[PDB]
Symmetry: D2
Subunit: 380 residues, 4 copies
């Protein structure tokens, strides 16, 4: 029924054989056949299918209201599998500020195989319509994006993609299926880096893909089985386990996010704040219309690099590390950690200033997170 119940009871995460209330870990590569071609439960070779991986695939298919799930060894392996639905000469549209690893994959790997890439500002969906070529086959959208949390209208992107015969894809990592369900809005394929919120505990690298389209699912299964970027059984088990508390974790994160944003907007040492919950944020009404909560990623401007580093050193509960979606609150400086190969002038033009801080809110006590960050800002 309701979402928190669906997280516990949706998907197949018990053992039919023994009744075990958690998914067994099938640390196995192959399976006894009673006769040639006769499989007991449909398993014959773990790269093709493994029952622990099937459990996590059924969870992601259920949570996104799809019919088919796929579990990959990382988020970028999920993205690579989806991009391999195309051939040389095909063209894909992505939002201009897509995740750095996606950018790297498309422009440094798949362009050598004749995939053509166009980055457009999808916050205005008519941009997509202008960029469509006769060879365009895929539309790939992240919303909200990193690190400035730009919002793209999912339902209009789905309509444009249907009209022009495109496979539509949404990277739903930042929102999770708890708050945003692209397949319900007409999107063909939804994917996640489960390394972040879904696993939730900073201890699994994994990607997840869901679809409702039988034929796209067939093509994805073929690509998974031939290029072999499969998630292993132990990581599948830890993913299933982490997803159980997704609802609780996202709601705690959202409570802290609201309070932290009030604090950041009131503080003298903070300039602009980027987050889709701010009413002045571009496409705020679009976000509210397609999601019913918020990501825990917030970006905000302090004066300069030295202020950003002082902020990191003065906080007690914000940890300096890469990734996001942990139970710990994480802090980072994009201009130094993810955008440092961009020339400084272009960085400044795109909004990645030297004092742009990104925090990923965790599940610590709201008042501790607000107070800690405020007292650190006070030292500037």
């Amino acid at each position: 029924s309701n979402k928190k119940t669906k997280l516990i009871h949706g998907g197949h995460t018990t053992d039919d054989y023994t009744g075990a209330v958690t998914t067994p870990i099938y640390q196995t590569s192959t399976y006894l056949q009673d006769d040639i071609g006769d499989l007991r439960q449909g398993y014959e070779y773990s790269r093709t299918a493994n029952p622990t991986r099937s459990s996590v695939e059924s969870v992601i298919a259920t949570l996104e209201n799809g019919k088919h799930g796929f579990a990959f060894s990382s988020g970028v392996a999920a993205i690579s599998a989806v991009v391999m639905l195309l051939d040389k000469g095909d063209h894909i549209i992505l939002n201009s500020d897509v995740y750095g690893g996606t950018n790297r994959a498309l422009t440094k790997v798949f362009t050598r195989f004749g995939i053509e890439v166009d980055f457009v500002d999808t916050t205005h969906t008519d941009s997509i319509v202008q960029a469509i070529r006769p060879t365009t086959k895929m539309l790939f959208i992240e919303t909200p994006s990193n690190p400035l949390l730009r919002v793209t209208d999912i339902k209009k992107s789905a309509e444009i993609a249907k009209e022009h015969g495109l496979i539509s894809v949404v990277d739903n990592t930042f929102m999770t299926p708890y708050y945003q369900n692209p397949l319900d809005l007409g999107i063909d394929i939804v994917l996640h880096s489960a390394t972040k919120y879904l696993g939730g505990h900073s201890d699994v690298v994994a990607g997840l893909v869901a679809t409702s389209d039988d034929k796209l699912a067939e093509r994805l299964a073929f690509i998974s089985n031939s290029t072999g970027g499969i998630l292993g059984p132990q990581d599948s088990y830890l993913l299933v386990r982490g997803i159980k508390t997704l609802g609780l974790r996202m709601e705690q994160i959202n409570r802290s996010v609201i309070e932290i944003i009030k604090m950041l907007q009131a503080h003298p040492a903070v300039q602009q704040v980027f987050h889709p919950s701010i009413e002045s944020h571009l496409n705020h009404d679009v976000h509210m219309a397609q999601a019913d909560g918020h990501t825990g990623v917030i970006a905000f401007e302090v004066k300069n690099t030295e202020s950003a580093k002082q902020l990191i050193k003065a906080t007690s509960y914000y940890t300096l590390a890469e990734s996001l979606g942990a139970v710990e609150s994480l802090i980072s400086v994009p201009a130094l950690m993810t955008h440092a190969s961009i020339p400084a002038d272009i960085r400044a033009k795109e909004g990645i200033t030297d004092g742009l801080v990104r925090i990923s809110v965790g599940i610590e006590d709201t008042e501790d997170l607000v107070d800690d960050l405020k007292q650190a800002l006070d030292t500037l």
Copy 2:
């Protein structure tokens, strides 16, 4: 010094911090940084590098006398990573009977990205010289091959590849680094499905790649980090653990292989036997010159399909399952399980007759394996 010692002490498989005599399992995605960019031990994000995966990478680099190791989520993910060293328009030569999954990957995935594929009979290396085009960039060799155990001259293939400016690659799965070291013979890249002998226990799906070439290693690392088919830490740990007994397991397997072949050649219900240890086998002297033991895969002909199935049902210690390299002895019928989409007439022409049986010898007692298979053959 000697090989069995190198299996135990080669590579880095202890913990420098606590002294733990086995590699810790770093079930983690990210790492504390003391200052922005300052990494304690060089780790920052597990997709890029994880200390358990690094341990298994150092083992495979040591065992193959290379300098760089890479661990992938499966054998075909290793092969896909290596093939992505090429661009559209590039051409690769493979042996004609390469593994079915490699065939599938090249001709159903990478040809859609403009990679051109030519299959040649590499048992005569001048075949390679005839097939070389101006666009050829890679030579990819399995030796011995599946299921007829055709042998290709590794050192001459390396020389041809150097002469014509080609990246040379050997799939060394069947022999393992215990018996055959392609990098010592001039090959650029060696790879393995560690799902088979290296893991040794039918419980990990994994691929491993080693090279001595700094720049190829750089390109492989970039591809691994951008397409993300990484082996997880638990599977890396189980791989490191399984490799410890590789020498013992391969020597037991080889003792049984010799005795089983004597039995098969003497038996009236058995026609041809395929294995590189038979002196009448094509390129037997080449195999003896580049390897110092034998794979545990044997193929042999019985009369027909019904005889093959009766053989499977009458054996007590040969298990019907896919894969090879287990501690259990495995049995299968290629014409029904791996080549069943080939038309029957072409199957017969290539040697995949309806009574072709493939066994993968395990580590059971030699006399039990010989006696069990002989008494099963006696029922024909």
Copy 3:
């Protein structure tokens, strides 16, 4: 600072060596010594100490405001270790309705070793004072108890134990350290079956013990190392991981508990309800004074056995299984599952009627749990 923050940042759960933000899994039995007796980080043999187990021990010591933690292979192994602080001839006082496994251990195992056991109704603490003999050495209290949730005054029990020279022990399983901290009230030893709420996910069997007493800690460490009921590293890791969400899970559980109790008290098919939050419950004010939340275990009476079974069959979200503290809501019938060896007449006298149902509230949506149970009760 606050409890939800302490759950994330208390204890040592990162790797000092690599910076990994989660505790490495030291799947290892022994450790390199640089010289005889010179240990790198103090480890020499995993039964004596293992770094993953040390991580979970430091978490439980921190959460209970103790100084020493101990991790055992199960809750009853923790209890057995604590009972082995006594000698033959020593006498221990327990509350009369202590957990069945504790009862079994004391009266069927440790009485054969000369430990003398007296069960008393500790809801009136002067009962304890009457039962104290010259040979009494230990006072062992569960509060609240199973399945009728009887409450015992912890601080008065601690005072009585100090006055008469007794080791005081509280089984704090039902409340968890999130809501009740016996060591803060003068108790010598606190213990838990971490199989329940602390692990939280129905996937680890484990016990945890904390103390602030150096000499009791020394004796516990000696007993642990000599009788060897240690928790393994993988289970320690999963425990540390599950504890991160303890605060979120307990607060969700408490919201549902309050609403479910309102429903149960209003329903015509339900007679008595047992839970310390009910103001008419014995020692309700004592519970409120020593805890600041509630267990998720509730017991209530329906008419008879057939009604209880119909209740189980009509619910969609209450699962029939043993244990408690899962993310799933669990349901059971004590008279049939935990007290079925007691004669029926004594069962009825102690309150374990044939229609006594026990539910363990999970983290599903509150409205789904209330509605599901109410509609099941309506079918009676």
Copy 4:
């Protein structure tokens, strides 16, 4: 049939449900019941029984030709469980040089519970007959013992135990079931620290117990379920996995042991050598009669402490660590590491001289181990 085959195919180590060729890891605490008391496959609570633990229990029962297996969280937890078959006032006979942890348990823990302990030199079995009291209930034998490898006649001990109504117990750790089967010789209970050879890889702490006696098995199961020192599922899985190569590992170890002993006996810097394979060793013919191979533990005398430490520093392939039975060869000095609390004069009297070295032979190449140790001895 033969032993190496039995290691692969004995016991239940596949999944009946999916056909998985390895035992699934049931990381679970509890199990769905279809109706109250109706268990799908007999499981209801993992402390009582877990399917991965059952798999390893069936392996040890098969390998020792028993009917019931039990898996404990460590070797000393297995020993404690067996000792808890007795009551206060009962008396147990052990060999005088029993393992230090067993000694510690009996004389520092179980004597406080009224168990009476007598240590006797069981190398002459009439010693046992002299020590039998009217209260004696158990005879507990290690053969061969640590560190001087004293041999006790198992079959005569079984006969004495039957004659006088005693439970007979053999700690079979050093020999493993591959070479010595006490239950075949009339012993009631056999136990192992699986931390050593059975796991084989220095990565599991575990104990294993087998018996053929239904009523002793019932009592052991009750003790296991009430005191709760159970092995966890991941450690059970790693045990099952390690046991597969036990035969191969023990045979390699035995080849190296024979050659190393020839070298040690010829070397001028080495005085006495202790190992049951030496024909002048006490009860050599008894060992040959009850076992058909040898332990990998060897002890030998050098001049003094400084020589022992120089030996440790000069070896390349002998690792200084505690435990034994690894794939790595291990070295230690008992007088400094296991007997350092004994006064020096009593140490010298019992044979634990300051230059007594103990090595545990691993599976490195025989010639490397012989040459390395000989060249280290040459530096004295």
